[PDB]
C-alpha cells in the first residue's frame, strides 16, 4: 500500500490512472463546442 502519510489520497489514486482517457473524451467535447470544424 501507500505510505501512511499519504493514506489520505487512496481513492484519488484509484482514479488517477483513468485520467489520460479523459483527455481523449475532452477532445470530442471541444469539437462539439466548435461544431466539428
Amino acid at each position: 500500500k501507500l505510505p501512511e502519510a499519504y493514506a489520505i489520497f487512496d481513492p484519488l489514486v484509484d482514479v488517477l490512472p483513468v485520467i489520460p482517457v479523459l483527455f481523449l473524451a475532452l477532445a470530442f467535447v471541444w469539437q462539439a463546442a466548435v461544431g466539428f470544424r
Binding site: 481513492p11 479523459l22 467535447v29 463546442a33
Partner: peptide, 27 residues
Amino acid sequence: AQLTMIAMIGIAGPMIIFLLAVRRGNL
C-alpha cells in the same frame, strides 16, 4: 469517495471548454 474525486476531475475538463465558450475564446 472514489466517485466523488472522479467527479471533480471529470468536471474540470468540460469546465475549461465552458468558460472559454462563454467568454468567446480561442476555441
